[PDB]
Structure 1
């Protein structure tokens, strides 16, 4: 490769070959006039060093330098290592027809579609635009097609729309971790230079919007396109391939809107009346003659799948609210009503979505999830929660508690200085009393935030759940946990020191009143420890997962049944405390070897070549089986692979 000017930049291999050829020529010329033994031995030694430097530098002795201070590379050092061919060009390689930009949100699309810039879509689909133009006849040749694409008058936009309506793309993230990393969506021509992905898949990607870069790839062959529509679709990979929890998880804004919806109160505007249906309920809520959450007996009408596929309609009355009825209007067909009568928390809505999926199916389930997202965002926009400095309340007993804490600390210090106890027990007493005071402050502030605000009941007083912003945000499972709200409101307790121990002088104040420089420096180092070790932790995790995926790859299901009666004896794993993994989640979907009999007196339950599912799990739970002899992948005896009978149900299906 040349450089700036007529001079050409030398290469490592070129220099090594030049040195070897020069040494060979010198040896051949010197072995003509009968050169002495010392000179020919020195020449042979130099030629040996030259050929060693050409083959493999750094292994034998020192590494010869081809520059000022950088060690020269050889064929062995270029092939092996991190920058080798196997890791730089064979497996990992650069591809075309791809883009990258900053993502946004755009909460106005369905699930099997995402956002993508208009100019980027025109640039990525240039061959498709050329083909469509040449098949329509509006272009003369490739030069005319290039001129039309670079001019952009009016036909190119509709041609791009035509090719976008029926061409899914595959977005891509750089740090992929699990299987769900490259999905399939449908672009929409949106002005701008950013990507508008669905907010529900962000929690699945463990992604955010802090200027992150996302890549996109577009298939261009019919088999890969069909494979994408069958497997890579977000409306197909709902169930997670690890456990049984699906991937469509309601986001924090959605769960906050639903929690504000189904939050019943003791008195509101229009409490103590009856109405016909949720239709009139939402009408009255929009008119303003009735509150959003008010106890009103509304007649409901649902269906049930008690028959063999046929649904039975029924009509009854239930004492509920208005928001609950409005949320019930978007329910699909066959679901009970006792699922929208509680507070509808994060685990509650997760269980409800899982139950709706497993009872009805897939397409109405994803439609219901999209509708839930829409209605949650809409009601969040309608209400809007706001955190206030007055909404955050400091307990009035925190001063007295910390005063008693300092008094006990001073008493222990004086008793230790007087010559009674040792520094070890003094430090133990200090840490335990400080932990006790921190836990007391935390529980006090939790009780305050959970029942601070009260309302009337058309005549007297009544205590209920507090209508505080932080309390709602902590109870709906949106953002923040118990320790999180503790750190936000009250004392953070003690925190460890870099060596491994913990500081005997904890934090006195919280974040609202005022910390000192000393406590700030303590928290600084306590957080910097983690902020420094997380990088090496991620590096070690990446190395471990690479080693695992490299050591366990050659295994393809080649047969259906091997015809063996071996496996692992399933026993309930118990570690000191209680049952960790339940038997249902343990043998959920796995064909057993022999005929598993009922634990009764010689009663056959399930056969030996059948798939186990939820019904069989319920039967096993009713029969109370201790251990179930099921097959195992390591117990399977299949030549070059593992049969499908020694695995059971496929995950994510």
Structure 2
């Protein structure tokens, strides 16, 4: 029962319940003293039972007693139980000290064991450590002086902070924490600004993307906690998924696009057919604007095989490859075949590179290789100049003819329903198949048009080449995108479902490049709203299931 502000008081409902019980017990004693009639004594005993029941467990014996706010009172049981009870809100999940929270950005210069911590958060979280060091080196005589220097933001406080942080791991967390990779230990690098810089390769573990997500920062204090963070919780030790064993640090997006563009083959490029002494020579050739990055060359590759028994066999042969694969061979550690690089590298190929590096080399080589893959992919995705434009969505010329033929055949089945040859359900299931085959044929035509091109070789002949379209490269590299999204981009959006689950007979024959009219957009919203609502309910149900399983 405490004074909030300016004479206003805040109490607990237990006070009201206990007051009722005491008042009615006193009334019962007074009635017994006065030798009251039996009916009044009986009613008093009845209310005593009711009040004690409301105190122990309100809303169970009868109607819940409500306070002056027209809300039910909270009893002992109601606060030892429930989601907002003692157990789940204060004994299993606790608010903690030495904690912070900030928006997360991307640090492409960081390493796996490093995270970018703002100096303000580091100063506020590591304050007792700063005080300790200031006293032990004698810059501050007592704790008050140390606080004065820390608050004044003196110069030496920053050196003290960079000595405390030097080898002190910090735990980064993101809500929700679906699995154990949602909390990881990093070595802090102190940065200006107010945002935490996160290594890209760990984002997939956090399910974190930089559109405004925030992360929590925890500072372990005791030596045992620091050893646990450095030995068990380090991001370097956490590179395999505990669910399946597959690597979780596989590159995505920009890295995959860069490594894919670097490992592609172009026909009749500048510097084709040259002979190169090795990866360094290929790098020299591309930096000198002699051979294009997609030029076919013959490169002398030295290659070490590490057998299962530990045999390290070195060999050197001349391999037909491109300049880009020759360069990428520089960062591949010894003990791996060149056949792992001598191909266009999508997401699956890079995942296989990391998997085999872990299998035949261990963890340190794997983490160094993952870092180098990330830097090379970022650099060459930057140098590539991949850009999405409006001429990149090549709508096939067969789409209009197919739509016209589908309309003609739908009208033919429309003048055949009156003949009684078919039923309404048969007409429905036939128009649906007509349009659901027109969709497949339009998608196939678009993919055939978009994934091929015709180039001129050195001889002068016309030769088919895999296309270098931006959207096609995005989809084929596996970076971000798929065939269905391209078919909704440049083909046909397709048949859609009514809010009940039924399928509208007339599909959306227009794509996003040429735009939709009002009805098509309404039909699209019909499914968008379902998707969002089902995502929300799915999150709730999955959380409940995970809690029961744990």
TM-score w.r.t. structure 2 length?
0.97
For 1:511 and 1:534, locate their aligned partners in 2 and report how far apart those are by CA, in whole Å. 24
Q: Secondary structure at the match of 1:441?
A: helix
Question: Within 5 A, what are the aligned runs for 1:26-37?
Answer: 26-37=27-38
For 2:544 and 2:307, locate their aligned partners in 1 and report how far apart those are by CA, in whole Å. 52
1:172 aligned onto 2:160:
no
Cα distance per residue 1:119-161 (max 9 Å; x no partner)? 1111111111111111111111011101111112221111111
Match of 1:242 in 2: 243
Q: 1:170 Cα shift?
A: 0.7
Q: Secondary structure at the match of 2:314?
A: strand
Indicate the larger mover: 172-181 or 96-105.
Answer: 172-181
1:485 aligned onto 2:472:
no
Q: 1:308 Cα shift?
A: 4.7
On the 8 A contact 1:256/1:380 being kept in 2, the answer is yes
Question: Within 5 A, what are the aligned runs for 1:90-169?
Answer: 90-169=91-170
Q: Secondary structure at the match of 1:25?
A: helix
On the 8 A contact 1:454/1:462 being kept in 2, the answer is yes
For 2:456 and 2:189, locate their aligned partners in 1 and report how far apart those are by CA, in whole Å. 48
Q: Secondary structure at the match of 2:229?
A: helix
Match of 2:189 in 1: 188
Q: 1:162 Cα shift?
A: 1.1
For 2:62 and 2:502, locate their aligned partners in 1 and report how far apart those are by CA, in whole Å. 46
Match of 1:354 in 2: 355
Q: 1:94 Cα shift?
A: 0.7
Match of 2:371 in 1: 370
For 2:378 and 2:535, locate their aligned partners in 1 and report how far apart those are by CA, in whole Å. 34
For 1:142 and 1:58, locate their aligned partners in 2 and report how far apart those are by CA, in whole Å. 54
Indicate the larger mover: 470-479 or 270-279.
Answer: 270-279
For 1:204 and 1:55, locate their aligned partners in 2 and report how far apart those are by CA, in whole Å. 46
Match of 2:218 in 1: 217
Aligned length: 549
Q: Secondary structure at the match of 1:115?
A: strand
Q: Secondary structure at the match of 1:180?
A: helix
Q: Secondary structure at the match of 1:388?
A: coil
Question: Within 5 A, what are the aligned runs for 1:367-406?
Answer: 367-406=368-407
Name the one with the larger helix percent. Answer: 2
Q: Secondary structure at the match of 1:189?
A: strand
Q: Secondary structure at the match of 1:334?
A: coil
Question: Within 5 A, what are the aligned runs for 1:455-474?
Answer: 455-474=456-475
Match of 1:536 in 2: 537
On the 8 A contact 1:454/1:466 being kept in 2, the answer is no
Match of 1:312 in 2: 313
For 2:536 and 2:74, locate their aligned partners in 1 and report how far apart those are by CA, in whole Å. 29
Match of 2:298 in 1: 297
Report the RMSD for the aligned CA atoms in angstroms.
1.4
Q: 1:332 Cα shift?
A: 1.1
For 1:307 and 1:244, locate their aligned partners in 2 and report how far apart those are by CA, in whole Å. 20
For 1:280 and 1:452, locate their aligned partners in 2 and report how far apart those are by CA, in whole Å. 30
Q: Secondary structure at the match of 1:145?
A: helix
1:40 aligned onto 2:49:
no
For 1:244 and 1:33, locate their aligned partners in 2 and report how far apart those are by CA, in whole Å. 80
Match of 1:71 in 2: 72
Question: Within 5 A, what are the aligned runs for 1:80-99?
Answer: 80-99=81-100
On the 8 A contact 1:453/1:468 being kept in 2, the answer is no
On the 8 A contact 2:116/2:191 being kept in 1, the answer is yes
Cα distance per residue 1:1-33 (max 9 Å; x no partner)? 224432423421101111111111111111112
Q: 1:518 Cα shift?
A: 0.9
Q: 1:502 Cα shift?
A: 1.5
Cα distance per residue 1:57-84 (max 9 Å; x no partner)? 1112211111242111111112111111
1:307–1:484 distance in 2 versus 1, CA, 3 Å: closer
For 1:512 and 1:316, locate their aligned partners in 2 and report how far apart those are by CA, in whole Å. 49
Question: Within 5 A, what are the aligned runs for 1:508-523?
Answer: 508-523=509-524
Cα distance per residue 1:586-613 (max 9 Å; x no partner)? xxxxxxxxxxxxxxxxxxxxxxxxxxxx
On the 8 A contact 1:255/1:478 being kept in 2, the answer is yes
Match of 2:12 in 1: 11
On the 8 A contact 2:336/2:357 being kept in 1, the answer is yes
Match of 2:449 in 1: 448
TM-score w.r.t. structure 1 length?
0.82
For 1:68 and 1:291, locate their aligned partners in 2 and report how far apart those are by CA, in whole Å. 77
Cα distance per residue 1:411-442 (max 9 Å; x no partner)? 21221134331110000001111100001111
Match of 2:281 in 1: 280
Q: Secondary structure at the match of 1:232?
A: coil
For 1:478 and 1:7, locate their aligned partners in 2 and report how far apart those are by CA, in whole Å. 60
For 2:334 and 2:531, locate their aligned partners in 1 and report how far apart those are by CA, in whole Å. 49
On the 8 A contact 2:357/2:365 being kept in 1, the answer is no
On the 8 A contact 2:66/2:72 being kept in 1, the answer is yes
For 2:61 and 2:479, locate their aligned partners in 1 and report how far apart those are by CA, in whole Å. 61
Match of 1:431 in 2: 432
On the 8 A contact 1:320/1:341 being kept in 2, the answer is yes
Q: 1:455 Cα shift?
A: 4.2
Q: Secondary structure at the match of 2:45?
A: helix
Match of 1:585 in 2: none
1:418–1:2 distance in 2 versus 1, CA, 3 Å: farther
Which ranges in structure 2 are unaligned for 5 or more consecutive residues?
none
Name the one with the larger strand percent. Answer: 2
On the 8 A contact 1:453/1:467 being kept in 2, the answer is no
Q: 1:504 Cα shift?
A: 1.5
Match of 1:568 in 2: none
1:45–1:252 distance in 2 versus 1, CA, 3 Å: same
1:298–1:242 distance in 2 versus 1, CA, 3 Å: same
Q: Secondary structure at the match of 1:72?
A: coil
For 1:158 and 1:226, locate their aligned partners in 2 and report how far apart those are by CA, in whole Å. 24
Q: Secondary structure at the match of 2:367?
A: helix
Which ranges in structure 1 are unaligned for 5 or more consecutive residues?
550-653
On the 8 A contact 2:496/2:524 being kept in 1, the answer is yes
Match of 1:61 in 2: 62
Q: Secondary structure at the match of 1:316?
A: strand
On the 8 A contact 2:267/2:455 being kept in 1, the answer is no
Q: Secondary structure at the match of 2:316?
A: strand
For 2:245 and 2:45, locate their aligned partners in 1 and report how far apart those are by CA, in whole Å. 70
Q: 1:404 Cα shift?
A: 0.9
